[PDB]
């Protein structure tokens, strides 16, 4: 499993409105 | 090979075995149940309801039981309720078990279930007065498009409890609204217009069948009405036209046997106060002496009720006195009324009046008044529950001779049968009385332990060649195999003690063998007891004390006191025999 | 009084166990004999007496029953002695003869018939799940050279 | 009423709350004003929570506070009644599959077993039956309860994809049903054995382990009835209907 | 004896009953004869090295 | 603004936050200070979900995840968290690889099956086609949809290295697609038939469990 | 009595508790309130050790562990905290269940052995648990269960039917995992392998392997003569 980096990453954009 | 079992033997094995062995016996004789629902139903009908439930639970995981099986199980539960009602010893079927069986049948089959099964469930819930369960069944059935008037009346009978009896009143109201004429027809059939004091004489003569009056459907409806009128408050019981009509027509009627009249009248008038009761009774007597009207302190009142009966003096209207006996404030007052009341004098020895008096005194004390009644030398068939409660009260009183004599002179005659606990108390009284005398023989005690015992279940296993045949001519009438009486370990201990006190330990050996054979009830130290009685029969005190020592060393110190008590009992018995 | 009530010894069931019929009770009899005398315990097929049958006769006459059946935890060969063969018999529950009496009468019958088999013990089963074969978890033999 | 003053905090409690276990030394030490307790305020928090709820949850992560809670509760002799000396906290579910495989077609007969009695195999069977009826005909499979803790499912020779679908659905419903009871699937595994020496029969042992985390009824016989082509009884044969004259009027509405 | 023991159940077991699993006993021979009626495995000896 | 008190911790939040879903029994539980019996850990997740329409359950803490899910479903909020055909909170994926060979040509067929129906499997088939058209020609493999929630993938003539490529690529795409749909892999375990003797079929049974953590 | 004020917290405790070690700098610094420059967080561990004599340091909090050790070494308390079987339950437990199962058509036979990687697991308690849950489920004449040694339990069943064999095995595994977890563990993982026997055709051996990690649950945790001679002998 890719240890998600300490930064804003694509695919995580669902979180932001 | 040489010997082969028969269906009767298999059924008797089922009856003897414990409830747990039902599934194993089912699986061992699985060729008998898998494809023949007919004899599966026969087995359920021939075995008690508990074993029937166990057998159905076992077959659930193996076969696909059809609704006939649940029909038979509910019928057997109803029959057990009927038998306990007729006897007075057993306990009614748990409404929880009945409802569980109905729900299981619903879950396996559902709409395929008959409405007769719903009737059976309602009638099985009636005795415990589970009005919520009755309403739940009614809602289920009407939602599934099966609501019916018999279900309505049975639900009214179930809901007749003083908690939400207005619900039962509404149920009967709707039932009448649909069947405008059934309630009036039932009341007028209970008291037909034609029947009079002239007709009742011929009716009681009974030289011809003369089947006329309450049709069985009318009788069931009338029983439901009886419960509903009994449970209502005495204000509405007279306000409502139906309740007043039922009471008036029941008090004046001869289409019913006196025992049924007593039961229904006492139940219906259980809730009335004394003054209202007397007023209603006098009004009904007056209107009866005037004709027939269609509808659809203590000493003086006692004397006037005696006059109410004596003004007509029909041999049929005996229980007019039993009803006032039940309504009388106290047991001493009941004895006073009996004394003052003395065909009417002949009615005293009727079993119903004595049973009513014993029931009236049983609630309060039934010790000294009951003693006087029994000593009044009227041996009759008293109710088993009342007799058992009476002997229990006397045993609580810790007075042996009165119990022993009352039993030996009143109970063994008239064939009145006690309960298991009453038998235990009576046997304890017998043991202590015989010890004090150190006069009922050990043989008499052994005979009493079985003959006088009354189990709540009923024998139902017909013999092989006696069932109503589907072929050939039945040689012999259907004979029922009387299920063998089972002895409690407590009763067995008292029988052993009585035998050893009265001498012959061979009687105790016989009792132990009988108990072990019938119910496999083996005492924790039966080996030591058997060896003790063995050496006692042949006068070996040194061997007896050696056995006591070894029993203390092996089983424990506490368990040796029972054996030592047997030793002292034997020593007392044989020493008294030598001294006398 | 609390000493007039002997303590008892409803019944639970485990899916597979020994079901003793309602009229019978299972007793344990331990016996002994010499292999060189009895042609063995029992023969399946037939073409000195069988210990099984002689013991059956002795037990039947001692108990006053027409016939009884005995099954042994071990079926020794012909010529094999037994020091303690433990077997069980289902007898009626109404006899109530003391083990001393039963063994004495069986010994008397065997001695009259001159068949040398001994009965070490006779005893009712505390737990009626006993089976002489299926409950025996070890068997001890000795060979003596 | 009663005042407790622990290192960093103050608490007020009833004499009854403190004496919920009077004979215990904990209660005996305070026979009915400010009271001094050396114990840590967080230890006293858990102790008071147990006294107010009768439920004690030791702090797992903070083994230190757990240790002082145990030490104080044992010095005060209340731990014995806190813990005396339904469903089990763990549920092991076993599945045994007997599979036969021809060329491209596969049949499986599997027995499912639980570790305890409390589980509603009736409900599990019903769930499986509903989720399989609308996907594949009953002619190729069955599913009925065989024991208070066991159930059965079978299929006939059927394509490999179809058999995989049936087994996957059965296991999905098994997990959903056992989780509905408050159990979360902790672990699991699978094993496939060689085929029998002269036969194509294979045995697949599949295990789940669950750890405890915390209206219309349908008539359905336990053992089903297989359906040959033509019906042997009329369509409405099942239903029983009371006599039309005997029918009565609605007591309820809707 | 070993061949018979191989194809032998342990005690009395019955299992469920379904219309498919029926086991008719109309054999066509006497039930009094028990020779050859036992269930037996075929003795199979594996090869030596 | 209201205050919610838990086992040993305190929170406060806006009436609007708590009433974001008024029809919910959770909303009616706050009829205009409050005390709740849930653990503060469980309460923080639901409060954050109300605040930010966010939900990411801890797959590493099964106890907490189960408590949170049960609390939200009992409070009628889980449906608003996971709006729909309803996806199960746990899904099982069975991947059976049947290996055969005749006259020296070895083939094998993978069958993927999902426990539930809500999954879109045409998308997984699409993704596998896209990712394998580059690795191999379609003459040697074929993947389609047998029916709802079941997929088929054959390979008739494939070298050892190429088969090793195909298997790993298919598994990669399966796991990635399922996790993207709003799930997270919890456990995976496989088995094979030993069968040293010749066997007409060999079976590689792979099992995946997917637990619901996120949404989409 | 004594009130101790630390960087962020106020405490009150007893002079005897402070003087449990009279010879130490503690009793020298508290000769009959005061202030310390030790973190209030680091102070509770020391106070709990003094009041209870337990100083289990926090492994997760490496810092606070370091400051606790530093303060106790400076004040001479580490040599008392750590002065120079169930000795300790290991953080990871491996339990191996090896069972030979013979499988005929409707028949199944089992010979199972349970072994632990460490001592202190109350295997007698597990034996009693399994006996309790099985003696109601099937007669003891079919099956047998006892402990062969420490760390080892044994479970035999003579030829038994299919469904009941499944019930016995499922129950035994249920009890194994329940016991091991209840005594203070949690099943991190489980995996199995299967082998065919070298002799018999219908027998095979299953080897189950369960790895348990300590989870520190909420509820409290704990933390015949053979014959030799026939003739008479002196």
Own/partner pairs, D80-87, CB within 8 angstroms, 24+ separation: D81/D21, D81/D24, D82/D50, D82/D56, D82/G220, D83/D56, D83/G219, D83/G220, D86/D118, D87/D116, D87/D118, D87/D119, D87/D181, D87/D182, D87/D212
Chain E contact probe: residue of B27, B29, B31 with most E CBs at under 10 A: B27
Chain C contact probe: residue of G139, G161, G229 with most C CBs at under 10 A: G139
Element (H, E) at B369: helix B368-375
Q: Which residues of G96-108 are buried (b: 16+ CB within 10 A; e: fewer)?
A: ebebbbbbbeebb
Strands annotated E in chain D: 2-6, 9-13, 34-36, 90-101, 105-113, 141-145, 150-155, 158-159, 183-192, 201-212
Q: Which residues of D90-101 are buried (b: 16+ CB within 10 A; e: fewer)?
A: bbbbbbbbbbbb
DSSP structure class, residue B148: B
Asked if G112 contacts G169 with a C-beta cutoff of 8 angstroms, the reply is: yes
What tokens were used for D97? 């599959």
Chain F contact probe: residue of D107, D165, D183, D204 with most F CBs at under 10 A: D165
CA angle F201, F202, F204 (to 5 degrees): 140
Shortest CB distance from F191 goes to which of D179, D184, D191? Answer: D191
Element (H, E) at C86: strand C82-92
**Chain E and chain B touch, per 3+ beta carbon pairs within 8 A:** yes
Burial of B105 (0-12, 13-18, 19+ CB in 10 A): buried
User: Alpha-carbon distance B458 to B479, whole Å?
Assistant: 13
DSSP B42-104: HHHHHS-HHHHHHHHHHHHTTS---HHHHHHHHHHHHHHHHHHHHHSSS-PPPHHHHHHHHHH
H-only helix segments in B146-273: 149-159, 165-178, 182-190, 197-205, 216-231, 234-239, 241-251, 258-268
Which residues from G are below 8 Å from F when comparing CB atoms? Answer: 191, 194, 196
- Report the relative pairing of strands D183-192 and F183-192 from DSSP bridges: unpaired
Backbone φ and ψ of B300, nearest 5°: -65, -45
> Length of chain D in residues, anyone?
254
User: Alpha-carbon distance B529 to C98, whole Å?
Assistant: 11
User: Alpha-carbon distance D128 to F172, whole Å?
Assistant: 30
Strands annotated E in chain F: 2-5, 10-13, 34-35, 90-102, 105-114, 141-147, 150-155, 183-192, 202-212
CA-closest candidate to residue B402, choices B442, B374, B437: B374
User: Alpha-carbon distance B179 to B212, whole Å?
Assistant: 22
What tokens were used for B184? 């009036």
User: Alpha-carbon distance B217 to B182, whole Å?
Assistant: 10
User: Alpha-carbon distance B154 to B135, whole Å?
Assistant: 11
Q: Which residues of C105-130 are buried (b: 16+ CB within 10 A; e: fewer)?
A: bbeebbeeeebebebeebebbeebbb
Own/partner pairs, D81-85, CB within 8 angstroms, 24+ separation: D81/D21, D81/D24, D82/D50, D82/D56, D82/G220, D83/D56, D83/G219, D83/G220
Burial of D219 (0-12, 13-18, 19+ CB in 10 A): middle
End-to-end CA distance of chain F: 31
User: Alpha-carbon distance D74 to D69, whole Å?
Assistant: 8
Q: Contact partners of G by the rule of 3+ C-beta pairs under 8 A?
A: C, D, E, F
Q: Test C6 with B522 for CB contact under 8 angstroms.
A: no
DSSP structure class, residue B410: I
User: Alpha-carbon distance G156 to G109, whole Å?
Assistant: 8
Residue with tokens 């276990």: D21
CA B20 from centre of chain: 26
Backbone φ and ψ of D117, nearest 5°: -90, -25
Strand partners, B384: none
Asked if C39 contacts C50 with a C-beta cutoff of 8 angstroms, the reply is: yes
Residue of C nearest to B569 (CA): C4
Q: Taken in order B489, B495, B501, B506, is the CA torsion positive or negative? A: negative
User: Alpha-carbon distance F13 to F20, whole Å?
Assistant: 12
CA-closest candidate to residue G94, choices G214, G182, G215: G214
User: Alpha-carbon distance C142 to B146, whole Å?
Assistant: 78
DSSP structure class, residue D139: G
Size of interface B-E (CB pairs under 8 A): 11
Q: Contact partners of D by the rule of 3+ C-beta pairs under 8 A?
A: B, E, F, G
- C35: which residues sit within 8 A by CB, 6+ positions away? C76, C77, C78, C79, C80, C81, C82
User: Alpha-carbon distance B376 to B396, whole Å?
Assistant: 23
Distances (CA, A) of D153 to D142, D174, E18, G25: 6, 12, 13, 74
Q: Taken in order B241, B247, B250, B253, is the CA torsion positive or negative? A: negative
DSSP structure class, residue F68: H
- State the greatest distance between any 2 C-alpha atoms of chain E, in Å, as a whole number: 49
User: Alpha-carbon distance D1 to F49, whole Å?
Assistant: 41
DSSP B321-357: HHHHHHHSS-HHHHHHHHHHH--TTGGGGSHHHHHHH
User: Alpha-carbon distance B399 to B390, whole Å?
Assistant: 13
DSSP structure class, residue B413: G
H-only helix segments in B376-525: 384-396, 400-406, 420-437, 442-451, 489-501, 505-519
- B224: which residues sit within 8 A by CB, 6+ positions away? B153, B154, B156, B157, B160
User: Alpha-carbon distance B290 to G168, whole Å?
Assistant: 83
User: Alpha-carbon distance B548 to B546, whole Å?
Assistant: 5
User: Alpha-carbon distance G38 to G7, whole Å?
Assistant: 7
Shortest CB distance from C8 goes to which of B489, B513, B531? Answer: B489
User: Alpha-carbon distance D173 to D152, whole Å?
Assistant: 14
User: Alpha-carbon distance B231 to B271, whole Å?
Assistant: 7
CA B571 from centre of chain: 42
Burial of G186 (0-12, 13-18, 19+ CB in 10 A): middle
Q: What is the dihedral of CA E4, E10, E15, E20, to 10 degrees?
A: -10
CA-closest candidate to residue G76, choices G37, G25, G18: G25
User: Alpha-carbon distance B154 to B131, whole Å?
Assistant: 11
Asked if B216 contacts B255 with a C-beta cutoff of 8 angstroms, the reply is: no
Q: Test B109 with D145 for CB contact under 8 angstroms.
A: no
Strands annotated E in chain G: 2-6, 9-13, 34-35, 92-103, 107-116, 143-149, 152-161, 185-196, 203-214
Q: Test F194 with G191 for CB contact under 8 angstroms.
A: no
- B-chain residues near C15 (CB < 8 A): 24
Element (H, E) at C123: strand C117-124
Asked if B454 contacts B384 with a C-beta cutoff of 8 angstroms, the reply is: yes
What tokens were used for D215? 């209206």
Residue with tokens 């003459």: F139
Burial of B122 (0-12, 13-18, 19+ CB in 10 A): buried
**Strand, helix or coil at B480?**
strand
User: Alpha-carbon distance B516 to B492, whole Å?
Assistant: 10
User: Alpha-carbon distance B128 to B123, whole Å?
Assistant: 10
**Strand, helix or coil at F141?**
strand
Element (H, E) at C92: strand C82-92
Q: Test B64 with D252 for CB contact under 8 angstroms.
A: no
DSSP G146-179: EEEETTEEEEEEEEEEHHHHHHHHHHHHHHHHHH
Q: How many CB atoms lie within 10 A of CB B492?
A: 26
Q: What is the dihedral of CA B573, B577, B579, C1, to 10 degrees?
A: 20
What tokens were used for B254? 């001869």
Q: How many CB atoms lie within 10 A of CB C48?
A: 9
DSSP structure class, residue G87: S
Shortest CB distance from E20 goes to which of D144, D152, D226? Answer: D226
Residue of G nearest to C131 (CA): G141
- F4: which residues sit within 8 A by CB, 6+ positions away? F10, F11, F12, F13, F34, F35, F36, F43, F47
Q: Contact partners of E by the rule of 3+ C-beta pairs under 8 A?
A: B, D, G
User: Alpha-carbon distance B195 to B191, whole Å?
Assistant: 7
- G161: which residues sit within 8 A by CB, 6+ positions away? E9, E10, E11, E13, E15, G106, G107, G108
What tokens were used for G26? 């503690």
- D-chain residues near E17 (CB < 8 A): 223
Size of interface E-G (CB pairs under 8 A): 26
> Length of chain A in residues, anyone?
17
Backbone φ and ψ of D213, nearest 5°: -90, -45
**Strand, helix or coil at D125?**
helix
Q: What is the dihedral of CA B107, B112, B115, B117, to 10 degrees?
A: -50
CA angle D71, D76, D78 (to 5 degrees): 95
Residue of D nearest to G8 (CA): D8
User: Alpha-carbon distance G11 to C140, whole Å?
Assistant: 73
User: Alpha-carbon distance F26 to G226, whole Å?
Assistant: 71
Backbone φ and ψ of C43, nearest 5°: -105, 130
Residue with tokens 């649909």: B178
Strand partners, F187: F209
DSSP D189-247: EEEEPPPPTTS-EEEEEEEEEEEE---------SS-----SS-SS-GGGG-----TTTB
Asked if B152 contacts D248 with a C-beta cutoff of 8 angstroms, the reply is: yes
Q: On the CB side of D248, how many CA atoms lie within 13 Å of its CA?
A: 27
Min Cα separation F135/chain D (Å): 26
CA angle G225, G227, G231 (to 5 degrees): 140
DSSP structure class, residue B407: I
- E-chain residues near D223 (CB < 8 A): 16-18
What tokens were used for D52? 């107010």
Distances (CA, A) of D192 to B148, D208, E12, G113, G193: 59, 15, 30, 21, 9
């Amino acid at each position: 499993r890719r240890s998600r980096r300490v930064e804003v990453e694509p695919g995580d954009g669902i979180a932001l409105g | 090979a040489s010997s082969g079992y028969t269906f009767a033997d298999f059924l008797r094995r089922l009856e003897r075995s414990p409830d747990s062995h039902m599934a194993p016996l089912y699986h061992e004789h699985r060729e008998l149940f898998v494809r023949r629902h007919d004899m599966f139903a026969r087995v359920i009908s021939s075995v008690t309801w508990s074993k029937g439930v166990a057998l159905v639970a076992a077959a659930g995981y193996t076969q696909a039981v059809n609704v006939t099986i649940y029909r038979a199980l509910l019928a057997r539960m109803l029959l057990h309720n009927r038998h306990v009602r007729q006897c007075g010893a057993g306990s009614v079927v748990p409404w929880s078990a009945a409802l569980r069986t109905y729900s299981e049948a619903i879950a396996t089959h559902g709409n395929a279930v008959p409405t007769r099964m719903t009737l059976s469930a309602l009638r099985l819930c009636t005795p415990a007065r589970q009005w919520v369960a009755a309403i739940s069944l009614l809602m289920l059935s009407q939602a599934n498009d099966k609501l019916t008037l018999p279900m309505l009346i049975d639900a009214a009978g179930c809901c007749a409890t003083p908690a939400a009896w207005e619900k039962a009143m509404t149920l009967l109201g709707r039932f009448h609204a649909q069947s405008l004429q059934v309630l009036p027809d039932s009341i007028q059939s209970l008291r037909p217009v034609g029947t009079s004091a002239s007709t009742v004489d011929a009716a009681a003569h009974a030289l011809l069948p003369r089947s006329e009056g309450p049709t069985p459907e009318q009788k069931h409806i009338l029983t439901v009405i009886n419960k509903v009128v009994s449970a209502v408050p005495w204000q509405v019981a007279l306000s409502n036209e139906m309740c007043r009509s039922y009471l008036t027509h029941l008090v004046a009627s001869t289409t019913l046997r006196p025992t049924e009249k007593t039961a229904s009248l006492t139940t219906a008038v259980q809730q009335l106060p004394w003054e209202a009761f007397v007023t209603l009774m006098k009004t009904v007597t007056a209107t009866v002496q005037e004709g027939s009207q269609g509808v659809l302190l203590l000493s003086n009142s006692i004397i006037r009720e005696g006059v109410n009966l004596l003004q007509s003096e029909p041999e049929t209207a005996i229980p007019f006195i039993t009803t006032i006996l039940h309504k009388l404030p106290s047991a001493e007052a009941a004895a006073l009324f009996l004394s003052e009341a003395t065909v009417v004098a002949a009615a005293i020895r009727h079993p119903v009046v004595v049973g009513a008096l014993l029931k009236r005194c049983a609630d309060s004390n039934s010790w000294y008044l009951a003693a006087s009644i029994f000593k009044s030398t009227s041996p009759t068939a008293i109710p088993c529950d009342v007799a058992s409660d009476l002997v229990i009260q006397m045993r609580r009183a810790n007075q042996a001779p009165l119990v022993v004599d009352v039993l030996q002179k009143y109970i063994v005659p008239s064939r009145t049968k006690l309960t298991e606990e009453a038998i235990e108390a009576a046997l304890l009284c017998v043991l202590v009385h015989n010890r004090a005398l150190a006069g009922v023989h050990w043989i008499s005690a052994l005979s009493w332990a079985t003959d006088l015992l009354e189990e709540g279940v009923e024998s139902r296993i017909l013999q092989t060649g006696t069932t109503p045949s589907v072929g050939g001519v039945n040689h012999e009438d259907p004979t029922v195999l009387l299920r063998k009486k089972t002895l409690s370990p407590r009763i067995l201990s008292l029988l052993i003690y009585i035998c050893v006190n009265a001498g012959s330990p061979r009687g105790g050996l016989f009792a132990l063998g009988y108990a072990r054979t019938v119910s496999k009830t083996e005492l924790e130290l039966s080996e030591e007891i058997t060896a003790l009685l063995y050496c006692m029969m042949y006068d070996r005190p040194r061997e007896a004390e050696s056995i006591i020592q070894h029993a203390v060393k092996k089983h424990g110190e506490y368990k040796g006191k029972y054996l030592g008590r047997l030793l002292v009992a034997s020593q007392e018995a044989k020493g008294s025999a030598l001294r006398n | 009084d609390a000493f007039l009530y002997f303590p008892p010894a409803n019944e639970l069931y485990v899916p597979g166990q020994q079901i003793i019929p309602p009229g019978l009770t299972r007793y344990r009899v331990d016996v002994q004999y010499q292999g060189n005398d009895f042609d063995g315990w029992w023969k399946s097929t037939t073409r000195r007496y069988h210990a099984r049958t002689v013991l059956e006769e002795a037990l039947a006459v001692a108990l006053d029953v027409n016939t009884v059946r005995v099954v042994a935890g071990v079926i020794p060969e012909v010529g094999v002695s037994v020091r303690r063969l433990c077997c069980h018999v289902d007898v009626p529950s109404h006899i109530e003869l003391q083990p001393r009496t039963v063994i004495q009468r069986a010994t008397m019958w065997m001695e009259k018939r001159q068949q040398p088999l001994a009965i070490l013990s006779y005893r009712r089963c505390k737990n009626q799940d006993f089976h002489a074969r299926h409950s025996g978890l070890r068997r001890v033999y000795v060979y003596r050279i | 009423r009663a005042v407790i003053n622990a290192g960093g905090r103050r608490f007020e409690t009833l004499f009854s709350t403190l004496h919920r276990y009077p004979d215990t030394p904990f209660a005996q030490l305070f026979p009915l004003r400010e009271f001094f307790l050396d114990v840590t305020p967080h230890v006293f928090e858990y102790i008071l929570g147990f006294l107010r709820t009768n439920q004690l949850n030791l702090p797992a992560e903070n083994l230190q506070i757990r240790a002082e809670v145990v030490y104080s509760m044992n010095q005060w002799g209340l731990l014995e009644h806190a813990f005396p000396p339904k469903l089990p906290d763990v549920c092991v579910v076993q599945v045994c599959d007997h599979m036969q495989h021809d060329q491209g077609v596969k049949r499986h007969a599997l027995t499912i077993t639980y570790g305890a009695d409390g589980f509603q195999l009736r409900s599990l069977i019903r769930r499986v039956r509903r989720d399989l009826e609308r996907q594949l005909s009953s002619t190729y499979w069955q599913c009925y309860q065989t024991n208070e803790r066991a159930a059965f499912f079978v299929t006939t020779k059927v394509a490999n994809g179809t058999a995989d679908l049936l087994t996957t659905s059965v296991t999905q419903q098994l997990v959903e049903h056992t989780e509905s009871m408050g159990y979360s699937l902790a672990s699991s595994y699978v094993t496939l054995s060689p085929d029998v020496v002269h036969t194509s029969v294979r045995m697949l042992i599949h295990n789940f382990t669950f750890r405890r985390s915390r209206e219309t009824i349908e008539a359905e016989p336990n053992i089903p009835t297989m359906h040959v082509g033509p019906r042997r009884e009329p369509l409405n044969a099942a239903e029983s209907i009371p006599p039309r004259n005997e029918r009565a009027v609605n007591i309820w509405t809707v | 004896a070993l061949r018979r023991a191989a194809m032998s159940p342990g005690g009395f077991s019955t299992g469920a009953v379904t219309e498919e699993n029926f086991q008719p006993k109309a054999t066509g021979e006497s039930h009094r004869v028990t020779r050859g009626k036992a269930p037996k495995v075929t003795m199979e000896k594996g090869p030596s090295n």
